[PDB]
Amino acid sequence: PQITLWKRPLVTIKIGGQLKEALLDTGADNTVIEEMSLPGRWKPKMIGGIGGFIKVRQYDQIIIEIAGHKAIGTVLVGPTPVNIIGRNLLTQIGATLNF
Amino acid sequence: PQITLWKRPLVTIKIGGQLKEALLDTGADNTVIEEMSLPGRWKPKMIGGIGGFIKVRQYDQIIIEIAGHKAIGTVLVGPTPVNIIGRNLLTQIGATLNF
Numbered sequence: 001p002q003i004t005l006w007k008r009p010l011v012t013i014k015i016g017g018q019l020k021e022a023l024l025d026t027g028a029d030n031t032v033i034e035e036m037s038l039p040g041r042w043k044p045k046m047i048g049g050i051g052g053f054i055k056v057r058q059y060d061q062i063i064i065e066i067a068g069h070k071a072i073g074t075v076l077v078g079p080t081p082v083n084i085i086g087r088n089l090l091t092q093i094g095a096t097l098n099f
Numbered sequence: 100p101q102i103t104l105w106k107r108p109l110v111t112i113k114i115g116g117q118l119k120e121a122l123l124d125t126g127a128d129n130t131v132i133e134e135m136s137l138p139g140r141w142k143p144k145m146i147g148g149i150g151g152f153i154k155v156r157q158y159d160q161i162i163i164e165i166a167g168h169k170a171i172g173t174v175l176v177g178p179t180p181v182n183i184i185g186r187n188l189l190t191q192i193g194a195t196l197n198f
């Protein structure tokens with residue numbers, strides 16, 4: 001689809017069997033999701049942006065369906081105010097910026 | 100152009116006659132630039148990011164070029180980790196997300 005930017009580019013995603021709303025963020029290197037349970041081992045990570053840093057848990061090889069498109073990659077879990085789909089997964093679903 | 104997301108979508112912008120680098124950010128409502136001098140009066144604005152909230156200076160009707168495309172709008176100036184071009188200006192250059 002072609003998503004216009006008059007409003008926040010929010011889509012429904014499915015991760016860990018759960019349906020969540022997420023923001024397609026071209027300004028995010030990683031994918032960050034609110035507290036939830038994910039399978040596998042994890043390692044701590046600090047991520048920053050406006051307002052500073054937050055500590056998150058890094059999970060690898062996580063599958064997530066973004067607006068009907070499945071992608072696999074690293075997913076960070078933590079106290080993010082918004083569920084964010086970053087570039088690591090945006091590339092997988094073939095998302096591009098066009099103008 | 101069509102911008103893929105394998106690397107950060109950084110473009111050259113021109114504001115106040117100066118060339119700077121900025122991130123095309125679909126996850127940003129507004130455009131936030133690092134400390135610099137802009138003409139006219141400014142109003143207060145509080146914005147939120149991944150790590151919390153920061154106070155910025157809001158300047159309206161600022162002439163700014165984004166990757167060769169001219170825009171005139173609101174530019175927020177403050178302690179942002181990176182210059183980001185938000186949806187307010189992305190809509191002016193006719194940018195869309197596509198997949």
Ligand SMILES: CCCC[C@@H](CN[C@@H](CCCC)C(=O)N[C@@H](CCC(N)=O)C(=O)N[C@@H](CCCNC(N)=[NH2+])C(N)=O)NC(=O)[C@@H](NC(=O)[C@@H](NC(C)=O)[C@@H](C)O)[C@@H](C)CC
Nearest residue numbers: 027028029030048049050126127128129146147148149180
């Ligand atoms: C400034 C750093 C680059 C852009 C930034 C945009 N993030 C979005 C995420 C959505 C909110 C959690 C954002 O901050 N958007 C703001 C930008 C400011 C603005 N005003 O446009 C926004 O739209 N804020 C809205 C409100 C959104 C909701 N906020 C809230 N409920 N508190 C607003 N009007 O203030 N990206 C990031 O913060 C990501 N950081 C990065 O990709 C890299 N970090 C750095 C510092 O470059 C990497 C080295 O970690 C985070 C997510 C980790 C992957």
